[PDB]
C-alpha cells in the first residue's frame, strides 16, 4: 500500500479560490500560514524532534513514499494545493471538504505548527494540539501547536468516538512517520472521497486525550 500524490484542481481559478478560503480562515484565527514544522524560542528545539525517542519505535517512511511527499510539497510551493475547501459550519466551526476527487491512499497534508514540549502545554487551551513524539520520559514528549502558525490540517474535523454510527464518517487517517530520523505527522485518505465530502479522521488514534462526546 503506497502513498499517492493528490490531483490539484485543473482550473487555476478553482485553486486560487481554494487557497483563498484557507487564507480567510487563518486570518480569522489571526494565524500565519506555515507548511512546515516550526521551532520557536521558549519552545522545543529541532534537536528534540528525534523519532528514536518514540516509546516502542516509529515506522519509517520509505524512499518511495518520501519521494511522493516531496512532490506534494513541491506542488504546494508552486500553487498546486490539494483540492480542499475550508468552510464554516455552524455546528462544527471551520471544516475541510473535498473540492475535487481524492482517491484512497492519497496524501492530503502534513500537520504543521509550532513544535513544543507537552510539559509546556499542560494548561494550554488551544483546540488543535496534535501529538508529535511520545517518549518514555514525559518531559521529552512533543506536541504540534498550530495556534500562531499552521496549515489546512488544523481545520480538519474529527469523529465522535462515542456514538454507534460515528465511526462511519471517517474517510481519512492521521499517521506519524520517521523522516530523516525526525517525527512527522501526515493525513492520508482511507477511501475514495467525492467532491463536497467533508473530511473526518479519528482525533484519538493512539491516546484518548481529545473529548469528542458532543461532536456531530
Amino acid at each position: 500500500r503506497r502513498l499517492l500524490p493528490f490531483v490539484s484542481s485543473e482550473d487555476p481559478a478553482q485553486r486560487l479560490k481554494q487557497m483563498g478560503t484557507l487564507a480567510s480562515a487563518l486570518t480569522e484565527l489571526q494565524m500565519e500560514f506555515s507548511d512546515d514544522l516550526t521551532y520557536s524560542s521558549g519552545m522545543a528545539p529541532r534537536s528534540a524532534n528525534q523519532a528514536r525517542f518514540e516509546e516502542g519505535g516509529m515506522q519509517v517512511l520509505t524512499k518511495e513514499d518520501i519521494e511522493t511527499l516531496e512532490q506534494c510539497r513541491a506542488m504546494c510551493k508552486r500553487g498546486d494545493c490539494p483540492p480542499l475547501l475550508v468552510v464554516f459550519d455552524s455546528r462544527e466551526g471551520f471544516t475541510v471538504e473535498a473540492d475535487g476527487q481524492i482517491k484512497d491512499m492519497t496524501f492530503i497534508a502534513e500537520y504543521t505548527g509550532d513544535v513544543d514540549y507537552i510539559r509546556n502545554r499542560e494548561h494550554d487551551d488551544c483546540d488543535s494540539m496534535m501529538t508529535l513524539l511520545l517518549a518514555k520520559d514525559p518531559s521529552k514528549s512533543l506536541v504540534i501547536c498550530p495556534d500562531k502558525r499552521g496549515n489546512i490540517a488544523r481545520f480538519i474535523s474529527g469523529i465522535n468516538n462515542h456514538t454507534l454510527d460515528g465511526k462511519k464518517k471517517q474517510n481519512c487517517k492521521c499517521v506519524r512517520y520517521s523522516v530523516n530520523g525526525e517525527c512527522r505527522v501526515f493525513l492520508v485518505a482511507t477511501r475514495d472521497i467525492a467532491k463536497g465530502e467533508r473530511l473526518y479522521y479519528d482525533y484519538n488514534g493512539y491516546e484518548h486525550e481529545y473529548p469528542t462526546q458532543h461532536f456531530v
Partner: peptide
C-alpha cells in the same frame, strides 16, 4: 486541561 489529538506511530495507513 489540555485536549490533544493523537495518531499511531506503527501499523501504517491500512
Amino acid at each position: 486541561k489540555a485536549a490533544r489529538k493523537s495518531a499511531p506511530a506503527t501499523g501504517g495507513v491500512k
